[PDB]
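Justification of computing resources. Each target in the renewal requires a structure prediction run like the one illustrated here; the chain below, 33 residues long, is used simply to show the kind of job we budget for.
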Amino acid sequence: NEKKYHLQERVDKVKKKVKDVEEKSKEWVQKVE
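Resulting structure tokens:
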């Protein structure tokens, strides 16, 4: 039942993609206000 998962070298990189996509939102609060 390991085959199913084996999300170690894909489900790792994606964790550092939400931080990236959460940096271009900070710049929005600064411009609208």
